[PDB]
């Protein structure tokens, strides 16, 4: 059976991913950085819906531990048919006030983690010799950008062009590379058309969308998921 | 029961779209500009999936004709939840060499279709008070432009700026509106990341997917299935 | 001595594009619809910057009129370097609102307009031989869509497509093919509504001057510019 | 009155067109290089023979606490700058399996953490001057649609943009407009003659673009006239995209 790895799966978004996916009939490998008993709450959900499921825990910045402790999981359940690439951080602040810390945790969260989450799981990939999906989520600000977030923008946009670079190189091996972009989610209102924030299933639906085999010739793009925010 | 109509749905992608929204549970009308025996195929196929179906013939550019044979249709069987509009011609040539006809009728069949179908059927589905679906169907041609279809190119965009605008008015009535941008599918290679053409069904797919209760939040888009092409 | 064709340069930006490329060295044949005498007063002001200048009268969905006032136009003073289409009306209102007239006419003034005037200027432009330039003259509206413009945006969103594609065509005869996005500007006849909704949105603030964007248009036709093709800029003060 | 622009990495190339191009329109520039020392002093002389006013400066934009400081020095002998051109940038190419981690790091930090770093310091004289300003960055026609064999420099180029299009959210306010241009194939990038022939079949104008022709882009965006031009990407590639 397919599986599927979603970083950040514990709570919010990545949950509902999770939780998706199961339905839809995939293994899904739950992973938080911390909340440990959140992430098996989760893993027995997906259990209770008839697939496979345990936990990983790892801080996606630890490049050295991600790379051991995922070399191993491949080792012991096989490679990962799909990878969601969920978890992310913000540090808002004006630019000039932004301090080190707030920048740096902020770009290496998201563009660190694309590295030292895909890099060991690109040749596992490939060897299920069946194809495969990887998703990652952006956001509306690393389309449009936004105040008080140029780290946050600049990371969520270096996703969406690593996003759609790996699209190309693994084209030829028949896994799609896929984008979605957020725009306000419950986990401004008078800017969105729609008049409300979007709900997690709202975001969590496209990114099963395109882990489908219907979604067989979407690669490269950018989906976003904002309720005509732009 | 909600309603679909999609246009040009006697072959090809539209066909295609028809037989999966009547998968998907909703009844599905048939359109065809002349192809009665062909659209009454589709149609007894739609109700062997087990959903009512009918045909409605007209040519999307006969503006009266049309407003007379929708708004008769809305009389007999209700508002249309959703519309598909699958309207386009080429006639492909370099610039210079277009004929006023090759420009006219390409130009007209996009956009004067979208304004020929959609104005007779927006307060119906208004007054549904349940929400609603929109999708137009524009090419990877309106996105990028093409060498020999500065016609079709400007035809394609067109829609798409209508249809974001239309987004934008229906918005609040829980009505969205999407645009599908196929790139080289099988019914019309070194450029395509895939390395092959689509199928109607690859297609076909993503615009289930956003007549769908799930794709609630996602609106004023234009969703590329082009392979990776763009 | 290059001449470039400005659509619709009697007054507003048309005409802050025609003086700004007189200025670059260019000469600049003018161009309006109805208004003979304000058409007049811009040539005037061209030849006092020391170019020629001349103005055409046609509504540009006259497409028989325009083509024989343009042929005639090339066969006297020699083939358009450069063409600047500033076409295009609106006709705003709700899209269930939208009479017949309201969709044809902006729909038509844009891309009729693109065809009617670019046909019968390209291959002069090409019997040149010495590259060219096109610029259109599009709208935030045909980027990102606005309410109440359902028929406009669908007119400028057409032309960027047209844009691109003729972009492709003509790449190799080093003539340049862009599109210019104004925002919000001066001059610029938009309903109260659309002002509102959009002041509100622009990060500088303010609407946009004439020149602000006619200095874009002028860089585009400029020889600096060659490399720039296919391209849609936006001048809308960060609108999108 | 005179107004003054560092232009990073500007001893050379597409950088030192954009210095050349600022100092003839009327700007005092300042030139910026990693290491070549000498390289950059005689750009510095034909700035000088321009008719303006330059001297340069010697940093890796990595280097947070140095730049910093030699920024603030600099602001604090010459004034603030007016404007800033982020052109320095670095490729380490190969496919995503076959890159190493300095292939990755140091892409991605010299164009995300040379943004952070170069600016940081000179927001706030640039406000001081009370008169706007100008910040161009440089991204790549990759960082817009990606590119094989540079999943590394999409992703920095790309977050590039979102830097570029949030800071000019910020500086509207002030007057300061904040854009990207976004060079396709240009004559100073080494490729071998079959990576060339195939990019030339894939540019409408069928050739690689000179410095120039990128440098006059980045010229008229800090010029007084693009006043109403701000959060853009202006794409300079032939036609690629």
């Known amino acids: 059976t397919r599986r599927i790895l979603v970083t950040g799966?514990?709570?919010?978004?990545?949950?509902?991913?999770?939780?998706?996916?199961?339905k839809a009939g995939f293994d899904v490998t739950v992973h938080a950085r911390s909340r440990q008993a959140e992430a098996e709450?989760?893993?027995?959900?997906?259990?209770?819906?008839?697939?496979?499921?345990?936990?990983?825990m790892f801080d996606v910045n630890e490049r050295q531990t991600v790379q051991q402790i995922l070399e191993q999981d491949v080792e012991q359940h096989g490679g990962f048919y799909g990878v969601v690439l969920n978890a992310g951080l913000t540090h808002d602040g004006a630019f000039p006030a932004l301090t080190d810390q707030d920048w740096d945790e902020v770009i290496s969260t998201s563009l660190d983690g694309f590295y030292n989450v895909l890099k060991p799981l690109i040749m596992p990939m490939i060897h299920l010799r069946?194809?495969?999906?990887?998703?990652?989520?952006?956001?509306?600000?690393?389309?449009?950008?936004?105040?008080?977030?140029?780290?946050?923008?600049?990371?969520?946009?270096?996703?969406?062009?690593?996003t759609k670079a790996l699209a190309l190189e693994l084209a030829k091996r028949k896994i799609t590379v896929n984008c979605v972009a957020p725009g306000l989610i419950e986990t401004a209102l008078?800017?969105?058309?729609?008049?409300?924030?979007?709900?997690?299933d709202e975001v969590a639906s496209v990114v099963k969308?395109?882990?489908?085999?219907?979604?067989?010739?979407?690669?490269?793009?950018?989906?976003?998921?904002?309720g005509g925010l732009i």
Do not use: W
């Open 9 to 22: 799966s514990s709570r919010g978004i990545g949950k509902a991913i999770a939780l998706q996916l199961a």
């Open 41 to 56: 709450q989760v893993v027995q959900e997906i259990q209770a819906l008839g697939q496979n499921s345990h936990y990983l």
């Open 130 to 162: 069946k194809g495969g999906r990887i998703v990652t989520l952006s956001s509306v600000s690393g389309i449009m950008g936004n105040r008080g977030q140029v780290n946050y923008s600049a990371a969520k946009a270096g996703l969406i062009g690593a």
């Open 190 to 200: 008078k800017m969105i058309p729609l008049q409300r924030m979007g709900q997690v």
């Open 209 to 226: 969308f395109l882990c489908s085999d219907e979604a067989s010739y979407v690669t490269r793009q950018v989906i976003s998921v904002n």
